[PDB]
Design a protein around this motif. Structure first.
Motif, PDB file in Angstrom:
ATOM      1  N   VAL A   1     -10.093  90.472 -34.377  1.00 24.11           N
ATOM      2  CA  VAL A   1     -10.240  91.910 -34.527  1.00 24.11           C
ATOM      3  C   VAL A   1      -9.516  92.725 -33.476  1.00 24.11           C
ATOM      4  CG1 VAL A   1     -12.370  91.876 -33.151  1.00 24.11           C
ATOM      5  CG2 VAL A   1     -11.940  93.773 -34.807  1.00 24.11           C
TER       6      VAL A   1
ATOM      7  N   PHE B   1     -10.025  94.965 -38.979  1.00 23.19           N
ATOM      8  CA  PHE B   1     -10.658  93.675 -39.084  1.00 23.19           C
ATOM      9  C   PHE B   1      -9.777  92.486 -39.429  1.00 23.19           C
ATOM     10  CE2 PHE B   1     -14.575  94.759 -37.614  1.00 23.19           C
ATOM     11  CZ  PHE B   1     -14.975  95.970 -38.125  1.00 23.19           C
ATOM     12  N   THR B   2      -8.693  92.351 -38.674  1.00 23.61           N
ATOM     13  CA  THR B   2      -7.764  91.245 -38.827  1.00 23.61           C
ATOM     14  C   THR B   2      -8.387  90.065 -38.075  1.00 23.61           C
ATOM     15  OG1 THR B   2      -6.675  92.190 -36.875  1.00 23.61           O
ATOM     16  CG2 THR B   2      -5.616  92.533 -39.002  1.00 23.61           C
ATOM     17  N   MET B   3      -7.670  88.954 -38.002  1.00 18.33           N
ATOM     18  CA  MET B   3      -8.174  87.797 -37.278  1.00 18.33           C
ATOM     19  C   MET B   3      -7.236  87.488 -36.110  1.00 18.33           C
ATOM     20  SD  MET B   3      -8.420  83.781 -38.306  1.00 18.33           S
ATOM     21  CE  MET B   3      -9.521  83.810 -39.678  1.00 18.33           C
TER      22      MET B   3
ATOM     23  N   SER C   1      -6.082  94.311 -43.885  1.00 14.47           N
ATOM     24  CA  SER C   1      -7.374  94.341 -43.275  1.00 14.47           C
ATOM     25  C   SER C   1      -7.792  95.757 -43.173  1.00 14.47           C
ATOM     26  CB  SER C   1      -7.376  93.609 -41.964  1.00 14.47           C
ATOM     27  OG  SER C   1      -6.864  92.358 -42.075  1.00 14.47           O
TER      28      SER C   1
END
Lengths: 105, 104
Positions: free
Chosen positions: B90, B86-88, B31
């Motif tokens: 954030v 911007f991982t899941m 990310s």
């Protein structure tokens, strides 16, 4: 006041659960990328590159002149001002007010 | 405590000096890292430059690190710069940049 490096978008009003399309266009991009950010100002798409991770949001179109994304299954939380930014010198921004309405009667 | 949670530290600088903003993450989950200024304007998304400010240079951009510099710092630069992954979901880490005046 006219400005070719100034993108334009449009407000959108939708019913909870519907789909919204945020469309941004620019006539002179000055070789700068378009970006869509949400009400909390979190980056949604930087060019064709997804940012905030949210399955309901999808890239519709990305050319140097247009950045358009959609949001399916719209929720009250999606309400607000979305900013389309073009990183030209200096930066120009255009806002799209997204309004979410519930079901009546 | 999370491997994917980035970290950076505050930077206190004397006006006219250079401030280096450094952010890292142990597990980026592939990310992107992004630096934004006190007004929340994107400065760098990955190695891709955003806001146009001659003073801002990219120091280095790897998948675990994003560092940028701001030369000839001014008061108008003071604030909290955010480093996002911007991982899941954030993850963010605030860097407070404090610009100091010169005595006498």
């Amino acid at each position: 006041s006219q400005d070719d490096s100034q993108p334009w978008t449009s407000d959108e009003t939708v019913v909870a659960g519907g789909t919204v399309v945020l469309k941004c266009q620019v006539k002179d991009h000055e070789d700068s990328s378009l970006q869509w950010s949400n009400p909390a100002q979190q980056t949604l798409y930087f060019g064709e590159k997804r940012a905030l991770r949210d399955n309901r949001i999808q890239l519709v179109t990305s050319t140097p002149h247009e950045l358009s994304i959609s949001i399916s299954n719209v929720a009250l939380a999606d309400e607000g001002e979305y900013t389309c930014s073009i990183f030209t010198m200096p930066v120009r921004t255009a806002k799209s007010l997204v309004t979410v309405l519930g079901i009546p009667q």
